[PDB]
Every structure is written in structure tokens, then in C-alpha cells.
Specification:
The structure is a homodimer. By secondary structure, chain A is α/β, with parallel strands linked by helices. Chain A has 16 helices and ten strands. In chain A, helix 6 packs across helix 7 and helix 11 packs across helix 12. At the A-B interface, strand 1, helix 2, strand 2, helix 5 and strand 3 of A face strand 1, helix 2, strand 2, helix 5 and strand 3 of B. The structure holds zinc ion (ZN) (2 copies). The PDB classes it as hydrolase.
């Protein structure tokens, strides 16, 4: 017969979906693949187990009927600005619509983004109502404490030349180091320089929108926003060693209020557990903090991570604002965050920040003083005085056991 | 220099088992496929590429050792019993001290620490008089004292293949093919038996004394919870997840207070291990389908998108229980027949099954729990029949 069609080209950042080309990361037809890697982050490993055990056909293709976004997001000019969005596929939510022809031609194209709605009921919001900080309105916040949200799950899609620029290194070096430091994950990183797009086996993020997603692209609508990096031990389990769930739920409260007043709110939840070191390293460091000579002091907080991990933080907030540009955000009126790394990345990428909203002191959990004092001393935003050397030397961390 | 140390999976001593060497500081010492920290090896690569981290860096493990001694237990050296984590992975600094000193760069794959966990649901349990602080397990602040262990995945491929009733050769070929060619050593290095996959692991929360988990005479209350970010963190009312998790935590605290021990394992398998994008696509299809969001269509909506109902493969889930020495679960705070079958099929007796109280089912979670009960999840009461399952129990939008 004939050789069917080859792999469709990708022109990253092109002005239209058709010129950009679809990300084809499925494996039903190897000849159509035009990226390195596969969809769903880490969960490609579980898909492989499902095929190996006979539960899933390696020929299966998704039926996308009725799955399209509940809310229209974009397109926006940022989707085609050179180098602006390099770690997600701006077209990834609307593939069934914008690549309908390519799907009909036989290219097996999966969404990398999904957009739905939810009622989120957080205990802290229920308490906020009881305390008179929040008042149900029936539209954004119900008397039950439920907040109506749009939520979008975004899986990672990396344009390697653009990622390299974002980190000020050559694409060749980025790709060689990705290959070497993963123990040889995906040799195409070094053997297929013609493939520009990489679907890494990492978690993505989820955006929670309070109000109308279209207002995110209108700087005349007051936007309250937080980008939160995953901390399972607090975000789920409420460990009192850190500030994470308190800051997350404070931000959610402020987003609900912002929407109620006629604005819009945004919380992005990014899968970067333990400063992207993972939870094992995180717990090893907790142990060293508590056992060190002199006790758990803020002046040693970062040193304890450096000794185990060789760096303080591997989250690389340089890629974090891509989701904001995807949503059309040009201005954040209230940024519910303190990190100078996040603030520098956001403003450095062209997003104006007006008010910085620090975490209220009464929300710092009982053993989180070491963390927050160390962060303020390291340059995180605070409206008042930064802890001095003497304050940072106080043994504020609880003993082990 | 020296070559790669051999691995003899399931050996009775750490020295004979050999260390998992999954670092990249000396390629000649590597004796596994893949690298440590699950997905976060990718971020380590960015750190090296950007100049922030030296590719020569080795951890200083000083003072990082477990806060609680877990094992060794007989299960650690029973052939085929533990195939998806390294039983020695928490104690490498102790049991592989000689190998570390000889220049093998060996990382822990498990870390064990302590915490005070303060959950709003537990504080409310106290306020409502369901829980009473005792000063040792539960404080008046609502804090519960726990031991917690983070466990990253370490797969013995011959053992995983057996667990899944397929040949190791086929398992490794399919892993290679269905990931788009991730790690060709899966097919080119059959001599490497151990694989460190780029997936999330799990976290165990222990209420009481970890040593009691290995004593079937001590009443054990346990739940294995699979990650649901949209509920576990954000409290979406479409599912039962955070309610069941926090109910289990309440029951574990009480079990410890009565002189027993409690265990919650939190496993990183978002969306039935399909991931969150697929999960949300299915929510949309559920709400838009002709006839509305009905329990009799709940599983079909996932099948249409994903080709299967569930990819969590609970057949590997009991490994952590065997690592902890668990031989009996007196109170299993769970309903899933797949979890129950996997636990009991691995030889662990389950005495009481503790279903989720009806009053804890969130406002839009009735479709989910009714479909699950009809699918065989444990319930003491009536199973919904065909007519009940056809009711439009799901909220619009
Ligand atoms: Zn935290
Ligand atoms: Zn759930």
C-alpha cells in the first residue's frame, strides 16, 4: 500500500491552531508521533500496566464526546507571542474543536487540558461564614459554604527551545542534562533534535477560577490570585510545621470575596511537592532540622535543605507564569503570596502586580514560625520589619517527639 | 574502580540484598533503571542544567534517619511479597554504611518523621463531643500526634510481572512501548531487575506505635486512600474522598486512644491513576449525557474516555502493609471490593469493614457511591437496584 501520512509538523507559538499543529503524543500510530513522551504525566506508567495486564487495548482511542470545556478560555494574543508560553499547550483544551480536521484525517490527538465546574466546600470557608468574614450571596458562595468555581486541569507540554531560553542555557545542553540526570530517560532528547516538544512524566497544575474566566483577560476587573505549590502534609493533612494550607485557604477566602465584589479570583495549584525535591527529601530535612545541634532555628532552616539536596529549592518559578499568560492575565491587583521568586517571575514576565497580600500572623501554625521567619529573612515580602539575626537565632522549632 | 553491586531481591539481610544505587554521580555503580524521587528527577535535571546544582552533589544524610524503627520483618524477605518498594529504603545509612563509605552513592527511598496534624474535621469532632483530647494521641488544640513515612516506588520487575500474571519480558516491552519509549533499558538490559519509575509514591500516617502494626494482637484501624486533589484539598462535593479520609483519621485516633494503633496510607493515584485531565473530561461527559448524570452510566462514562474503569491496580497496594509487618486489619475504613480483595488475597485478615456513614456523603456524591455499591463495594444496607440507579441523582452543569 502507501505509507499513509507522516508526523504533522509543530510550529510552536504560531498565530492559529492549524499553523501550530497538534501535539500527537499517543502511541496508537508511531508514525504520527511528533513529540517526545506521552500524555497524563506520571500516569502513563499506569496506562502501560493496564495494557500489559490485558485490561486496556493498546488500540484504544478516547471518545471525546461531551468532554469539551465548560468555559471558553482564549484564544488570547499571549498564545502566539514568541517564548511566552513554553510549558503548556495553549490549544490543549480545545483539540476536538481546533484539530477536528486532523482528528478526522486519523491523527490520534488527546487533550492536555480539561475545564469543568465544581462546588468546593472547605471547612475554613464554612468557619469564615460562621465568624462573619464571609457572607453567602447565593451566586458565588452558598449558605452551605460551597463556592462555585471553574477548574482547569493542565498537564505539562514543554517546548524545549523555549524552556532552554527560560533558563538561559542552550537547548542542546538542556536536553543532554535532562537525559543524563534522569538516568537516560528518553534518548530522543539527544537522538531526535528534530523533535522540539517534550511531554514530561510530571504533575501539572489545576486552576480554580472564582467568577468569570473571561474576566482574567480584562485588567479592568480586579483579580485576586495565588499560585500555590503542592504540600500534601499540610494541604491535605494539616501538619502544623508549615504555612501551606493556611495560605491556600486564606487565598480562597480572598478570591471568593473578590468575585462577590464584582472581580475575579484565581488559585493555581501546582504539583511541586517539597520544593520539587519530593516528599522523602522533605522529611529527611525535617529530621535533620529537629536533631541538629542548637535546635530547630530559622537561621539554619535553608542550610538544612542545602545539606541534603544541594540547593534550597528546585521549583523554578521561571515557568510558573505560563498558566497566567494562557488565561490572558496582564495584571494581578491582589497577589496572595510573599515569595520573591514567584513575584520576580510574574512581574518579569510582563504581569503587573499591585497589592501584595502577606499571610496574617494569626494564621501561622504552631510549629511554622521557623519556616516563615526564615523566608522573610531570605527576601519574601512582608509589610513590616524583617526578623534580624538575633530573632532568627531563637529556637522556635518544637523538639522531636 | 569498583563495579555495580548486585541486587538479590528479597534476600534475608541487607548485605545480601544489596543497595539500590539509582543516583547518577557514578554511572558504573548504577544497578537499576531510572532515578530517585519519582517525577521530581525532571526538576533535578533543570537544577543541573541551569547551574544551580552540581551533577556531583551527594546528600549529607547526617541526622536524617527514621524517628521510628520499622522492621525488619519476615515479610521483607519472603519471595514475591514486597515488589513495589524497597524494604531497606528507609535505613540505607545504617545498613549500607560500608557501601556508602566505599563510594556507592545510595539515596534513601523512604523517610520516617513525626508531625502534629490538625484537621478541621477533627477539631469539629472535638467540639461536637465525638472526640476527647487525651494529651498523648490527641491534644486539646485538635492536633493528632503521628509518625509519617514517605515511600517512593522501587519496582522489582520480575516480581511485578508475577503480580500481574504476565511475563517479565512482556511487562518490560509494554512499559517501554506505551510510554513512548521511556527507558530503553527496559528492553535492552534484562540483567537489570529493578526499576525506579517516575511516579508518585505514598505516605503512611501512623497513630500510635509503629511497632504495634506488626502485632496482630493490637487492634489496627486502617484506610488506604488514593489521591483525589479536588476533594482531599479542595472539598469538591462531587465525591466522597475527603469525607472518607477524615472519617478514617477520626477512627484511627480513637483506635489509638483505646490502646490500639491506626494507619492511613495516602497513595498518589489521582483519578483512578488516569490523572486529573481525564477525570475532568469524564465529569463533563457525565453532566452532558442524554438523560442526565445517573449512577447506571457512571462507569460507562469513564470507559468511553479511558478504555477501562480504573487503572490503580490494587494488587500492588498491600506491599506497604507487609513492609509495616501488618498481618491483620481489625477495622478497615473502606468499602472497595478491589482493595478488600487485594488485601485479603495477600493473606491479611480483615475483621470489620467500616463503610462511610450516609450523613457524610457530599451533596453531589450520590451518583458515585450508588454506582460503587452496585458494583460490589461493601455496604451493610440495601444495594441500589436498576431502578434506583437510573434516577438522575447528579446535579446539572
Ligand atoms: Zn507545607
Ligand atoms: Zn474524589
Amino acid at each position: 500500500h502507501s505509507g499513509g501520512v507522516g508526523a504533522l509538523p509543530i510550529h510552536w507559538g504560531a498565530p492559529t491552531a492549524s499553523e501550530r499543529g497538534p501535539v500527537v503524543g499517543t502511541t496508537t500510530n508511531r508514525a504520527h508521533r511528533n513529540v517526545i513522551g506521552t500524555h497524563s504525566g506520571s500516569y502513563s506508567i499506569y496506562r502501560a500496566l493496564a495494557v500489559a495486564s490485558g485490561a486496556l487495548s493498546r488500540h484504544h482511542k478516547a471518545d471525546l464526546t461531551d468532554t469539551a470545556p465548560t468555559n471558553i478560555i482564549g484564544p488570547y494574543p499571549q498564545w502566539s507571542q514568541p517564548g511566552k508560553i513554553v510549558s503548556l499547550d495553549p490549544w490543549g483544551a480545545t483539540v476536538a474543536e481546533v484539530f477536528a480536521a486532523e482528528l478526522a484525517a486519523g491523527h490520534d490527538i488527546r487533550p492536555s487540558i480539561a475545564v469543568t465546574k465544581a462546588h468546593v466546600i472547605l471547612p475554613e470557608v464554612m468557619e469564615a461564614i460562621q465568624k462573619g468574614r464571609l457572607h453567602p450571596d447565593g451566586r458565588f458562595l452558598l449558605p452551605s459554604g460551597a463556592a462555585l468555581v471553574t477548574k482547569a486541569a493542565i498537564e505539562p507540554v514543554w517546548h524545549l527551545p523555549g524552556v532552554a531560553e527560560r533558563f538561559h542555557c542552550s537547548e542542546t545542553d538542556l536536553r543532554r542534562v535532562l537525559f543524563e540526570e534522569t538516568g537516560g530517560m528518553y534518548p530522543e532528547l539527544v537522538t531526535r533534535s528534530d523533535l522540539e516538544v517534550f511531554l514530561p512524566p510530571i504533575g501539572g497544575q489545576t486552576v480554580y477560577i472564582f467568577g468569570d474566566a473571561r474576566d482574567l483577560a480584562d485588567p479592568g476587573v480586579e483579580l485576586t490570585a495565588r499560585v500555590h505549590d503542592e504540600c500534601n502534609g499540610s494541604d491535605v493533612f494539616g501538619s502544623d510545621i508549615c504555612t501551606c494550607r493556611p495560605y491556600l485557604t486564606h487565598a480562597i477566602e480572598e478570591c471568593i470575596q473578590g468575585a462577590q465584589r464584582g472581580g475575579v479570583g484565581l488559585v493555581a495549584y501546582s504539583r511541586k511537592e517539597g520544593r520539587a525535591l519530593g516528599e522523602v527529601t522533605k522529611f529527611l530535612v525535617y529530621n535533620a532540622r529537629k536533631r541538629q545541634v542548637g535546635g530547630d532555628t530559622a537561621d539554619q532552616y535553608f542550610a538544612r535543605t542545602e545539606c541534603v539536596a544541594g540547593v534550597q529549592d528546585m521549583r523554578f518559578q521561571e515557568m510558573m507564569p505560563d498558566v497566567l499568560h494562557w488565561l490572558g492575565v496582564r495584571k494581578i491587583h491582589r497577589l496572595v503570596s510573599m515569595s520573591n521568586m514567584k513575584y520576580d517571575a510574574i512581574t518579569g514576565s510582563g504581569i503587573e502586580v499591585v497589592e501584595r497580600v502577606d499571610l496574617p500572623a494569626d494564621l501561622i501554625p504552631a510549629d511554622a514560625r521557623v519556616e516563615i521567619d526564615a523566608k522573610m529573612a531570605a527576601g519574601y515580602f512582608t509589610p513590616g520589619a524583617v526578623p534580624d539575626a538575633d530573632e532568627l537565632a531563637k529556637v522556635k522549632g518544637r523538639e522531636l517527639d
